[model samples]
Target: MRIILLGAPGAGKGTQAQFIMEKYGIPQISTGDMLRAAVKSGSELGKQAKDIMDAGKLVTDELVIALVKERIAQEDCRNGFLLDGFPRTIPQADAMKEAGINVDYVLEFDVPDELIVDRIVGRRVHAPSGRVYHVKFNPPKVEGKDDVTGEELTTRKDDQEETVRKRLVEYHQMTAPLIGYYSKEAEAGNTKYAKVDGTKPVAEVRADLEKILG
Candidate 1:
């Protein structure tokens, strides 16, 4: 089913996105991955995004939406797709509608900003496999390395304390409105909108999501 997996940084959206993708046998459309895929294809959009990224400015929403539309038009997406890290604003959701993209469910992973900030600050990732670890919550087998591959694990620049806090502020200000938008949509019976307690154990989150998917 078409779905939007929405959550703040460190709220485990990425983890749950993986579960949805596997369960539905649908690919995920993440803006960052979409941009990279576009750049690899060397399309007109890709060229523009490459140039913009090389210049070190963030990619604009217009181009990002264009990439998303192009992505969902692919044959594989006909069944459905999981969307992560797009439609951060009401205007973006409007743009998706204008672009003829309709989602079936909007899963809002509700985690407090304080928890988000704390979660991110302790996070690290193994670059090759993208396996995540948290210093406080979940550490790897050996310190500072992938447990299986022996590759060095590194902390993301955005996961720094100040940067994480900055993102928390933006999440509350810019992205939280989509909750209201989807809540109203759910109320109208237009589509489902489920809120998961993201702070819970991963198994519990998966169980709740399974019930919704059924």
Candidate 2:
């Protein structure tokens, strides 16, 4: 399945993409990861992207489309791929189409801002081992410390109230129009789109996606 997972930063898009890719034996094509890989290798396209990134500005839609085109043309993507964190706006969506890359299902993880803030604020990770814990739902053995190492825990500044609110505003500003674009495209039978409740269990969301694919 050629799929796109859409959600704000804390909405579990990464988690769901991991799940789907493992389950279906497909690659997860994350724009950030792939572009960073290219940048690390100093490809021509990478150099172009780096210049724009160094300017502290968002990369152009055309550059993203070009990268996506190059990525999917790779051998590993022959079967299909799961896309996470690209085509964030309507123009990007149009750019993808203009480049002749079409998606099968664009999955939206519909989450409320309150829930997003709650999840982000509650999250903690053991930075060394990449072990994750949540204060409210999945706390570690010791309070305010890593269960494995007993190191003092940290709540990222990005997860702080002010930063999270600002991120929400930015997410909505871009995603609002893309939602309209895809929803209308689905209604027109041009491409399929589904908005699943993001706050649900992984199994439940996976089943919902299976139903949509069927």
Candidate 3:
């Protein structure tokens, strides 16, 4: 059930990742969360990452791979795990190969750049409950309020139109080669590679993924 889930910004990978976790009983590993925890632990790798982070420089691939290595070694990951927000570039993917970290599938969520921009620009979140809503697509029951907790919804800075466009450009540049890398791997029969139409309804996307994974 080990998988690499890929998606552009606002492509609904978060929703799909949760579904995959529930269906397969595997934990979802988010690199951002991992890095934060790693730095907090003050371990050897943590210290290295903290230093790099404090200096306002990006953490190198070496440290990221080390953190990922340690993360998957945990007891909960023995059954396998779903990785999100990782291997953003080919070098990182190569590092995973060098580390012998095999994945069963590389599932990409395919969405148009314009659609992604639309999706992200209208997005809001109930930070306390981690609930998300989109003004145009999936609005909350009450304007700017969480359905369950009634917390005021706030727009994330990243979801700002200017930021999203910038991110989309970066995403395309970083992911194009990575997608080619995985496609090549699939061609070589190393692993399965598939893409889901992310513009489709969530239920349809889930069904398609279930079929592909099965």
Candidate 4:
């Protein structure tokens, strides 16, 4: 199934995306990961993206749209792929629609702002390996070290309260509309839209997705 998982950061979208990908054997196309990979590749697109990124400005919709289009056309996407983070705005979705890229499902994870804040703050990450830990909930094997690499785990500023609150506002202003937007598409039979309680237990959320897929 061609799927879109939508939610604010720390809403468990990433965890669920990992689950769906592993269980269904479909790759998860994360825009950030793709962009970083592109930058590492040193391709023309990568260079352009890097320049824009280095300027601390957001990449243009056209550039991201083109990258996603090219990415979805890869052999791995032949069966289907899960889009973890892309089409963050109506314009991006419009671009996909214009390109005739129909999605089968748009899954929204519903979590309260306070809950999201609670989930994000105090989170630590081993960036090199993408290993996540939480000071309160899930800590590292050794105080501030990665289990595998023994590398120091760093807390992301994005996971801080002020940053998360700001991002919540940004998400409400930008990404939230995609919920109603996709709902309309669902009504039109263009895609299936479902909202899952993101505050629920991880396994429960996975169960919800499994039943939804069924």
Candidate 5:
């Protein structure tokens, strides 16, 4: 069940990734988390990553791939793992193959740019529990209040309209080629590729994913 989830911001990949992790009893290998974990271990790769991060410099793609290979070799990952934010670019995917890391599935959550912008801009968050509510879509039980705690919901800076649009543009620029790259790999039968309508209700999305997983 090794899988890579590809999606733009607000495409609901995070939610589905959670569901998949629980269903398969597999951990998610997010790049940020992996980097933090490596740094704490103080192994050679971890030490290098920590030094790079400490310098306030961007971690090179080579080091990121090294961390990924180290992560995939962990005992827990023997069964499978969900890859979240790694392989950020098409070249990264090529590097994964060069590093001898193979993925069984590549799943894309397809959401229109306009809808992604709408979804993100409408989101309000409860800082404590991390519950999210949307203005027009998934409204809070009471306007501007968390249903469980009645705490005021605040908007995140990243969710503003301008930020979301800027992110969407960047996402398309980077991710468009990745989709095609995986599409060719799928045709070659190297890995299975599936794209689901990310705009679907969460339940429907899960159902469609189950079909693909089976």
Candidate 6:
């Protein structure tokens, strides 16, 4: 199933993407990962993307679509692929449709704003080992201490409340409209759209996805 995975940061969308990939035997294609790989491979498009990235400019939609087009043509994607973190704007979604790349389903995760803020704000990490913990949801053995090394846990800059709020602002500014766009497409009988509650337990969220896929 060609799937469009949509969710705000800290919504566990990444975790669910893994589950879907494992169950369906499909690749979870993240645009960030794809761009990095493409740049590493030094392909022509990769070069163009690298130059744009190195210049601190956003990658153009045309370039991104080209990269995605190349990615989905691989043999591994014959079955389907789960798209995570691509098509962040209406134009990009339009590009995909114009390119004849139709999706089977659009899976959106819905978590309340304050809940997301709390979830992200509570996160702490062991800088050395990269072990992550959350004060409320997944606390370490000792408060503010790494379970393994007893080191002081640190909050990442991105995980800071202000930063997270800023990201949410950007997400709302760009990606939120794709929800309506895909919803209309679904109503038009072009694809399926399902919104899962992101605040649920991981297992429950996975079960919801299973039902949608069924």
Among these predicted structures, which one has the highest lDDT? 4
lDDT of 4 by residue, 29-137 (tens): 8875677567767777655776554443456788888888888988999999999878888899898888888989999998887787778876777765455677776
For candidate 2, give the lDDT of residue 65. 74
Segments of candidate 1 deviating more than 4 angstroms = 35-59, 126-131, 135-152
Ranking of predictions according to lDDT: 4, 6, 3, 5, 1, 2
Q: Write model 2 residue lDDT over 1-214, tens digit each, in one string.
A: 7898888757777656756777788898877556655675787775566644433245677778778888889999988898887887778788777867777898899877778778878887654443456787567789889876899776543457666776677678876678888888889887788889988865687788777765
The residue ranges of model 2 lying beyond 4 angstroms of the native Cα positions read 35-59, 122-160
Error of 4 at 149 (Å): 7.3
| Tens digits of per-residue lDDT for model 1, 87-170 | 877778889877677789999998877777678777877654456678867677888888879888887544667666666667
Q: Residue 167 in model 5: shift from native, Å? A: 1.9
Rank list by TM-score: 4, 1, 3, 6, 5, 2
Report per-prediction Cα RMSD to one decimal.
Answer: 3.7, 5.0, 4.0, 3.2, 5.4, 5.4
Better of 2 and 3 by lDDT: 3
lDDT (10s digit) by residue, model 5, range 98-142: 867778999999987778777877788775544557788668889
Each candidate's lDDT (Cα)?
Answer: 0.77, 0.74, 0.77, 0.80, 0.77, 0.79
lDDT, candidate 4, residue 209? 94
- Candidate 3 per-residue lDDT over residues 1-214, each given as its tens digit: 7899888878887678877887889988876456655565665665665544443334677767777887889999988899887886777898889878889999999888878777877888765444568887778899989888888898764466766676677777776678889999999999899999999887799899999986
lDDT of 5 at 192: 94
Residue 49 alpha-carbon offset, candidate 5, angstroms: 12
- TM of each candidate vs. truth: 0.81, 0.73, 0.79, 0.82, 0.73, 0.74
Candidate 5: the clashing residue pairs are: none
